[PDB]
């Protein structure tokens, strides 16, 4: 029957390939994709033809001038179609070669090409938290309808049927990602029952943004299979329940070398000064998450400390004791555009004075 | 149990083959098929025996003179029975060798054999849109019964459980088709939730028609497996919801060579003059689709433009900028007979003056 | 679909590994785990990097000083993720290298390193009994809701649908454990319908504790898959229904050699004197189990005998008739921390006089 | 069985009475009630004993000083218990005779006792709109779960099963209210499917506030019976669906006498000047309702007109043509405290200059 | 519980009355109603105050000039609210006293006031056929979903569970109507399973129209209670299944007196000449019903005969044999506006020459 067809091995019959072009839609938060057949395997992004789609249907163009252009930027193996088929992360342009307003990759690319940044070779590990929800009722997975599970406490990194909801989805994603070639560093059950996390491990500059988006694309496709819905809303349930963020861990060449801890403090300092303008691009709805309770710092103050999950930035015990490592900006929400957060951190930390 | 039997590998036990003869029924819109055993593998259509069926049961013949004859025309691998078994696309005739009124392949074959057409070597890519429906209630897949989903917008090329209904079926079909040997160029989720699309990529003359029909046959067989119903009705739900069409993309030898864009304009021009008579054969119910809203042009006007999804014909940005390519006739409905549309375009575009 | 992704073989695509760090949480009875990617296979515990987690979320640290450190101590193969992926049993410390109050491995390690203990090379076989419960109602698997099955009698080591509930889970676990490298000696259906047992066979000193914990981790993960709940509560149902214990079988070098039976009696003797203080660490709720009925001895008396399941300690017919073997301390409850019971027995039996 | 007991006629057995004391709770939007037995029928409010309740449980007092006092203010017949039993609308005070912060009846009473207001003898008709919701899912009655009914249009004052949801409840309420002695002037199905309205007809000064609250109490008690939930949230569903308000119709002695239309215009004028401060007390969430679409006027502008449902105030065709009547302030939300809106209008309209 | 409240007898507690004003909405086919309280019983229409409603919500007025006026024209007892409560049939006007375009009572009233018509004192019996449908699926009551019952034949005037669907509703209606004061002459099960009929017996001129509308109002309210949907669509199911009409039986003074049969033939004759223009106002969709099969006459021909259910007009055996009676115009569809058909027959039959 149905899975025999979806899992057909094509290699036995043609050289042809299926490429799934992924892009980001009109809201800056919606992933979209379509697929095309290509005549043979491809490993280099610049050897893939450009393409277009109906921008008038994604809120990015008018009906009379509907075409919007897709620039292939990164290739990953398609864990769904398997064999030689591929996912292609994309960039969006007018037919005139202008990047459209919702393309935030272009700006970020410039910052990561700019040679004083490139030389610092920044590293990002981003911690994507999300929440799983029952289709149609829109209530968190594992929660009874019109009710709540036991209070927070046993859920964080837990095991068992009354504690841990949807490991299925999570472990699936983890391998999918690995197979695809995403640098995924690890996963964990989070504090609010039904909330999970994966980390896209230390990735350089632009490719961090690319990998987080593709990882999210894979997550949602998996949840789609499962008949479950994901939100990246930073505070999906009001009251005594954790919000969800996208912690950004960060380091520069000079931060991970001898006496980098000094560079770290100095970077934090610069961040303190540009808190206000960082918050503004750190994803919407954040006001509902950053309250000072539930392992956040208040939106209005900026703070930092060592093992302090109540602070705006946190520095690992390990990197303190070694005088070198990385720090964690805990401010960005789970619905953060990594392109924006990732480059803005480099900019406020290297370029600006 | 049941799938062990349906998936038996016959190769281990005989040389014998199963051929599924497919034809088009009395309404010109209903596919029909039966199967026979053949003594060994066959790769050439003319080496398959002709056959007959009970036309009195498909509305094509009377009871007392019931026999109607099947001419094998194209072979494809059967993605259901797998191994060496085959699908055989067919043509319909009286025992006297007359093509029956519902055989539109014969006319089309003549036009594509006619040497001034053949030399121009026309190319067609056809975009089959369709809609998936819940068995028995006849309401679109994923829609709640006696109600509607959220308004159009997030569905086009979307991902996730609350957005994307029946990817299962779609991805299955895609591989099925590839395996079978249909030149299928790509797929995508369409604008109305539950509506999808596949494209039968650039195919020459008569074989375009053959492949579209066989692709439709595979689609409906898959939906059958799934316990879901397909309509090719061009406007299945009334009101603020997309209709479904069968866009025909077209090019001639001279159109894809240097300065073909001029030939394109001239062809469009000829099309403008024969709009009235094209509409008449562009599938029934089209009046309900072509309204000027929802990415169509009004039935009564003819128009064209560059990236204009509101026009009767559209010319890609890419082919404009290259002075050579193809244009898209957006007029045909999803229930179009590709034999009719495909040849009628060649006729109005090459032969007539 | 979903199990195709969870069962992806990673070996075909990278050298990378997934390690699941397991630890024991704030209540001393809750297992917790998270996973990370490592660059290649690892077989030695000391070659695994140390790690940390949010102790503020497991009741082990404050929010402002939240980091707690994980020391890898034992590696086993992950029977879930399979291939080269691993489970890593852990130990808990402050960033200052202090063992936290809930780390009972550290104390036990000292006792088993201490050279007069090491030389006696103690052996432990521990019999983990547990009960399976329906999710949400929290009533034993196979029991009708708000009611009881037939009285005890046909359930112990039974077979058939009306007698034996959840063998599925049990047999799964058994192989899981073997695969993982736990020395699991055997399994059996227990006396109360829905209650089962596995034995972690003769294991030396500290590794007994390690293996029991990891075996429990595997059990609960399996039940999680099954949509069923486990309790290690020593007496889950009040009345005429068996409780659950963690019998510890024990032997020293000198006990299993010629005329060890004398050493056995002498050990029992020492145990009689420290009954009071053993009970106190033999797991909470034990008062509800050890009643003198249902194959226990009363908490307040200490007793021993030969084939006597009504005594506090029991000595096998086999080891009596051979003048050498091991004895069974039937006192510990099913929710016993094996680190505590296992070393406390060595201490009261070798060191103290 | 159960309704035989609930409907027992007590008259046949004692003179005793049951009085249900109703009051308004800590949030200023939550009705609360408890019942006591009284020795014989009572018709005058001042002949009912005062009472108290646990304010610490309604967010109105601390635990150590928990008593809050209830002043009977209005009697109505209890339509649930029937016979001679009564509902008693209440007022809230400290034991020291201070009105508590959430008692808005006291202020309003003062304004309606103040002799220049009393002499003008103001009249209020208030139009309570509300929405009916499915228990637990919190989605509007008659809507399919995770979906929407047909667009607005056939619902307003409609009849039939596919159009009209919960008439049951509505018609019940209507008679309940009449029986009770509420001056209820009429009912109607509103624009958004599942939304209804009742009017508390022309009532003088303080008693308008009293009757609206008691009418709301009766409504919710009825929906409680039905196993359905009510919201007075002014905009329960986002998007192309009506919000809900509490239109206040108003007239003074001088407005309903010869050439009152002049007094009306002058009153409107005064209202224009105090729009800002009226909005602030016209119920919370109003920003989400008053948008200028769906028969509201934008929160930021003030406007008036004759038959204009798009304006902030509307004057009936009937009262224009007669040079005398009443005008409709369409600004208050459905969650308005009538005590506050009702007196504030008298104050801005008579006292202030 | 709920029916105790809906059936409260108000007479025991006030003199007050509930009046349900009914009118016809923007489509000319949708009934609408709302209710008001009146101070005492009323028996004469002209003693009821006029009223208004929001025409902007029924498609009859703009938002800025929203008021539309209701003229009470006929009173009937409300069979739902019972006691002294009343239904009030209405007429629609601008505030300027113009009848709105959808008010067809005004025209008809003129024709029935015009003294040469009045003197002929026309009589109408109209046969309302309708179909009952399952809510949400919109498939006829008693039909299995996605299928059909046995072929027509045993359904007409049938009895039994496999033959007769919804008698409940029907018998309820019948008494309701009688109670209300509608001159309802009789009922019967019709030919297509799930289709019924009632007749509004011999009623004079304008009051026929009034009574048919109010009868329809009562029908749909009843079906609403039942959780069932009604259509007056003339041909709800395509194929071998009866359509639904609104046969109009007609007689004038001179037709029911000695040798009226001559006047009858002459009237028929006049009708033959104005068939074309009668058809145009005889309700929309009629083309799908009037086919010449299933007891209709073809739309394009006009015919008459004696006991002929295949003709456009039919004359009873009884009135033929008596040389005096009435004839049956079988042409109007079930969705006919009786005001239009009823007066148009008088006009073509008396006034015009
Ligand atoms: N030097 C570094 N610079 C930037 N990121 C790093 C560095 N070292 C490790 N990381 C990344 O930071 C991430 C932190 O993940 P996790 O263990 O969830 O963080 P936390 O415990 O702070 O929540 C991992 O992706 C890791 O790849
Ligand atoms: N040069 C050509 N001549 C005719 N058909 C072509 C030509 N080039 C491409 N096609 C086909 O026409 C189809 C276009 O489909 P699609 O990608 O859906 O276009 P749209 O932008 O209208 O969605 C594809 O099959 C494409 O391969
Ligand atoms: N000499 C020994 N020292 C420690 N454990 C032993 C020794 N001999 C056997 N065992 C173990 O004791 C356990 C046997 O448990 P089990 O069959 O449940 O005992 P019983 O059923 O008699 O109460 C297993 O751990 C077995 O591997
Ligand atoms: N003179 C008056 N002054 C104040 N309110 C009045 C006066 N006359 C009537 N009312 C009341 O105002 C309320 C408006 O009800 P309704 O007819 O539903 O309003 P709308 O037409 O705005 O829906 C009713 O209670 C009506 O009886
Ligand atoms: N002289 C008349 N004029 C008008 N209607 C009449 C006259 N005599 C009887 N009727 C009525 O005509 C209607 C008859 O419809 P019905 O009994 O269903 O007839 P059929 O057998 O034509 O279906 C009823 O209102 C009946 O009372
Ligand atoms: C549990 P936590 O300590 C806090 C993050 C939290 N889920 C949030 O509100 O951002 O996450 P992590 O940073 O260890 O992943
Ligand atoms: C979304 P669309 O732009 C328009 C097709 C539409 N479903 C129709 O009504 O013909 O499809 P395509 O051009 O990407 O083929
Ligand atoms: C029959 P049993 O003695 C069961 C022991 C009992 N569940 C308990 O409460 O100790 O089995 P074994 O493990 O001792 O062989
Ligand atoms: C039809 P409407 O104008 C509705 C206005 C709307 N429901 C709202 O206040 O938001 O109410 P009413 O005045 O007829 O009661
Ligand atoms: C039996 P019939 O011809 C039914 C009318 C038929 N269903 C139609 O299409 O008009 O009418 P009657 O019994 O009501 O006169
Ligand atoms: Mn983390
Ligand atoms: Mn986290
Ligand atoms: Mn973190
Ligand atoms: Mn397309
Ligand atoms: Mn399309
Ligand atoms: Mn197209
Ligand atoms: Mn045992
Ligand atoms: Mn046991
Ligand atoms: Mn034992
Ligand atoms: Mn109103
Ligand atoms: Mn209203
Ligand atoms: Mn109003
Ligand atoms: Mn009849
Ligand atoms: Mn009839
Ligand atoms: Mn009739």
PDB file of C-alpha atoms in Angstrom, chain A residues 3 6-7 77 79-80 82 142 153-169 171-176 178-180 182-189 191 199 222 225-226 242 295 306-310 314-318 321 326, chain C residues 1-2 4-10 13-14 16-20 23 30-38 50-58 62-67 69 80-82 85 95 135 138 216-218 220-221 223-225 227-230:
ATOM      1  CA  UNK A   3       4.303   3.549   2.395  1.00  0.00           C
ATOM      2  CA  UNK A   6       6.446   6.769  -0.711  1.00  0.00           C
ATOM      3  CA  UNK A   7       9.549   4.737  -0.030  1.00  0.00           C
ATOM      4  CA  UNK A  77      19.963  15.444   1.856  1.00  0.00           C
ATOM      5  CA  UNK A  79      15.498  12.621   4.836  1.00  0.00           C
ATOM      6  CA  UNK A  80      11.942  12.054   3.637  1.00  0.00           C
ATOM      7  CA  UNK A  82      15.902   9.620   0.821  1.00  0.00           C
ATOM      8  CA  UNK A 142      -0.373  15.333  26.394  1.00  0.00           C
ATOM      9  CA  UNK A 153       8.902  19.812  37.828  1.00  0.00           C
ATOM     10  CA  UNK A 154       9.053  16.240  36.567  1.00  0.00           C
ATOM     11  CA  UNK A 155       9.001  17.076  32.848  1.00  0.00           C
ATOM     12  CA  UNK A 156      12.495  18.565  32.169  1.00  0.00           C
ATOM     13  CA  UNK A 157      14.636  15.775  30.625  1.00  0.00           C
ATOM     14  CA  UNK A 158      12.140  13.218  31.928  1.00  0.00           C
ATOM     15  CA  UNK A 159      11.174   9.769  30.906  1.00  0.00           C
ATOM     16  CA  UNK A 160       7.920   7.796  30.993  1.00  0.00           C
ATOM     17  CA  UNK A 161       4.432   7.986  29.587  1.00  0.00           C
ATOM     18  CA  UNK A 162       2.953  10.471  32.091  1.00  0.00           C
ATOM     19  CA  UNK A 163       5.905  12.823  31.805  1.00  0.00           C
ATOM     20  CA  UNK A 164       7.239  12.813  28.277  1.00  0.00           C
ATOM     21  CA  UNK A 165       5.018  13.654  25.292  1.00  0.00           C
ATOM     22  CA  UNK A 166       6.077  13.042  21.675  1.00  0.00           C
ATOM     23  CA  UNK A 167       9.628  11.683  21.953  1.00  0.00           C
ATOM     24  CA  UNK A 168       8.710   9.961  18.747  1.00  0.00           C
ATOM     25  CA  UNK A 169       8.741  13.220  16.919  1.00  0.00           C
ATOM     26  CA  UNK A 171      14.111  11.376  18.050  1.00  0.00           C
ATOM     27  CA  UNK A 172      12.872  11.242  14.462  1.00  0.00           C
ATOM     28  CA  UNK A 173      13.902  14.779  13.905  1.00  0.00           C
ATOM     29  CA  UNK A 174      17.286  14.301  15.462  1.00  0.00           C
ATOM     30  CA  UNK A 175      18.233  11.519  13.040  1.00  0.00           C
ATOM     31  CA  UNK A 176      16.533  13.251  10.093  1.00  0.00           C
ATOM     32  CA  UNK A 178      21.899  14.287  11.097  1.00  0.00           C
ATOM     33  CA  UNK A 179      21.158  12.404   7.917  1.00  0.00           C
ATOM     34  CA  UNK A 180      20.400  15.634   6.092  1.00  0.00           C
ATOM     35  CA  UNK A 182      22.558  19.660   9.680  1.00  0.00           C
ATOM     36  CA  UNK A 183      25.053  20.144  12.446  1.00  0.00           C
ATOM     37  CA  UNK A 184      22.682  19.248  15.220  1.00  0.00           C
ATOM     38  CA  UNK A 185      24.426  19.030  18.558  1.00  0.00           C
ATOM     39  CA  UNK A 186      21.776  17.597  20.810  1.00  0.00           C
ATOM     40  CA  UNK A 187      18.195  17.476  22.039  1.00  0.00           C
ATOM     41  CA  UNK A 188      16.308  17.485  25.396  1.00  0.00           C
ATOM     42  CA  UNK A 189      12.845  17.445  26.917  1.00  0.00           C
ATOM     43  CA  UNK A 191      10.372  22.251  31.410  1.00  0.00           C
ATOM     44  CA  UNK A 199      20.495  22.624  19.338  1.00  0.00           C
ATOM     45  CA  UNK A 222       7.735  15.581  10.763  1.00  0.00           C
ATOM     46  CA  UNK A 225       3.378  13.354   9.428  1.00  0.00           C
ATOM     47  CA  UNK A 226       2.443  12.815  13.068  1.00  0.00           C
ATOM     48  CA  UNK A 242       7.571  28.092  30.752  1.00  0.00           C
ATOM     49  CA  UNK A 295      14.194  31.304  33.742  1.00  0.00           C
ATOM     50  CA  UNK A 306      27.858  33.101  35.672  1.00  0.00           C
ATOM     51  CA  UNK A 307      25.574  30.076  36.122  1.00  0.00           C
ATOM     52  CA  UNK A 308      22.580  32.387  36.218  1.00  0.00           C
ATOM     53  CA  UNK A 309      19.506  31.271  34.263  1.00  0.00           C
ATOM     54  CA  UNK A 310      17.740  34.374  35.615  1.00  0.00           C
ATOM     55  CA  UNK A 314      24.881  33.626  30.912  1.00  0.00           C
ATOM     56  CA  UNK A 315      28.443  32.473  30.896  1.00  0.00           C
ATOM     57  CA  UNK A 316      29.155  28.757  31.456  1.00  0.00           C
ATOM     58  CA  UNK A 317      31.030  27.582  34.570  1.00  0.00           C
ATOM     59  CA  UNK A 318      33.312  25.736  32.144  1.00  0.00           C
ATOM     60  CA  UNK A 321      37.106  28.344  34.834  1.00  0.00           C
ATOM     61  CA  UNK A 326      31.413  31.355  24.728  1.00  0.00           C
TER      62      UNK A 326
ATOM     63  CA  UNK C   1       6.422   7.463   7.872  1.00  0.00           C
ATOM     64  CA  UNK C   2       7.514   7.728  11.564  1.00  0.00           C
ATOM     65  CA  UNK C   4      11.371   4.904   9.098  1.00  0.00           C
ATOM     66  CA  UNK C   5      12.925   8.065  10.500  1.00  0.00           C
ATOM     67  CA  UNK C   6      13.402   6.840  14.092  1.00  0.00           C
ATOM     68  CA  UNK C   7      15.190   3.761  12.694  1.00  0.00           C
ATOM     69  CA  UNK C   8      17.427   5.503  10.187  1.00  0.00           C
ATOM     70  CA  UNK C   9      20.834   3.892  10.022  1.00  0.00           C
ATOM     71  CA  UNK C  10      23.301   6.729  10.492  1.00  0.00           C
ATOM     72  CA  UNK C  13      26.142   8.789   6.219  1.00  0.00           C
ATOM     73  CA  UNK C  14      28.424   9.816   9.104  1.00  0.00           C
ATOM     74  CA  UNK C  16      28.937  10.878  14.257  1.00  0.00           C
ATOM     75  CA  UNK C  17      27.437   9.375  17.443  1.00  0.00           C
ATOM     76  CA  UNK C  18      24.555  10.089  19.778  1.00  0.00           C
ATOM     77  CA  UNK C  19      25.156   9.862  23.481  1.00  0.00           C
ATOM     78  CA  UNK C  20      22.288   9.937  25.983  1.00  0.00           C
ATOM     79  CA  UNK C  23      21.345  10.979  35.695  1.00  0.00           C
ATOM     80  CA  UNK C  30      13.592  10.197  39.168  1.00  0.00           C
ATOM     81  CA  UNK C  31      15.740   9.353  36.133  1.00  0.00           C
ATOM     82  CA  UNK C  32      16.560  12.205  33.718  1.00  0.00           C
ATOM     83  CA  UNK C  33      18.371  12.248  30.394  1.00  0.00           C
ATOM     84  CA  UNK C  34      19.439  14.374  27.485  1.00  0.00           C
ATOM     85  CA  UNK C  35      21.433  13.711  24.328  1.00  0.00           C
ATOM     86  CA  UNK C  36      24.415  15.129  22.514  1.00  0.00           C
ATOM     87  CA  UNK C  37      26.270  14.438  19.286  1.00  0.00           C
ATOM     88  CA  UNK C  38      29.881  13.253  19.548  1.00  0.00           C
ATOM     89  CA  UNK C  50      31.889  15.958  31.102  1.00  0.00           C
ATOM     90  CA  UNK C  51      28.664  17.858  30.830  1.00  0.00           C
ATOM     91  CA  UNK C  52      26.145  19.949  32.736  1.00  0.00           C
ATOM     92  CA  UNK C  53      22.378  20.481  32.990  1.00  0.00           C
ATOM     93  CA  UNK C  54      19.894  22.807  34.567  1.00  0.00           C
ATOM     94  CA  UNK C  55      19.746  21.624  38.169  1.00  0.00           C
ATOM     95  CA  UNK C  56      17.270  24.420  38.908  1.00  0.00           C
ATOM     96  CA  UNK C  57      14.768  22.322  36.931  1.00  0.00           C
ATOM     97  CA  UNK C  58      15.384  18.983  38.685  1.00  0.00           C
ATOM     98  CA  UNK C  62      19.099  27.412  42.580  1.00  0.00           C
ATOM     99  CA  UNK C  63      18.192  29.499  39.498  1.00  0.00           C
ATOM    100  CA  UNK C  64      21.093  31.976  39.953  1.00  0.00           C
ATOM    101  CA  UNK C  65      23.633  29.182  40.432  1.00  0.00           C
ATOM    102  CA  UNK C  66      21.941  26.615  38.213  1.00  0.00           C
ATOM    103  CA  UNK C  67      24.773  24.548  36.659  1.00  0.00           C
ATOM    104  CA  UNK C  69      28.029  18.722  36.444  1.00  0.00           C
ATOM    105  CA  UNK C  80      16.617   2.513  21.041  1.00  0.00           C
ATOM    106  CA  UNK C  81      18.811   4.483  18.685  1.00  0.00           C
ATOM    107  CA  UNK C  82      20.886   1.347  17.913  1.00  0.00           C
ATOM    108  CA  UNK C  85      24.871   5.214  19.730  1.00  0.00           C
ATOM    109  CA  UNK C  95      31.214  23.059  39.675  1.00  0.00           C
ATOM    110  CA  UNK C 135      -1.963   5.787  32.015  1.00  0.00           C
ATOM    111  CA  UNK C 138      -3.310   4.720  37.506  1.00  0.00           C
ATOM    112  CA  UNK C 216      15.404   0.906  35.134  1.00  0.00           C
ATOM    113  CA  UNK C 217      15.990   3.711  32.619  1.00  0.00           C
ATOM    114  CA  UNK C 218      15.487   1.237  29.765  1.00  0.00           C
ATOM    115  CA  UNK C 220      10.659   3.178  31.779  1.00  0.00           C
ATOM    116  CA  UNK C 221      11.612   4.264  28.289  1.00  0.00           C
ATOM    117  CA  UNK C 223       6.803   1.550  28.978  1.00  0.00           C
ATOM    118  CA  UNK C 224       6.792   5.158  27.682  1.00  0.00           C
ATOM    119  CA  UNK C 225       6.707   3.714  24.154  1.00  0.00           C
ATOM    120  CA  UNK C 227       1.754   4.167  26.614  1.00  0.00           C
ATOM    121  CA  UNK C 228       1.931   2.537  30.001  1.00  0.00           C
ATOM    122  CA  UNK C 229       3.161   3.706  33.426  1.00  0.00           C
ATOM    123  CA  UNK C 230       5.571   1.938  35.896  1.00  0.00           C
TER     124      UNK C 230
END
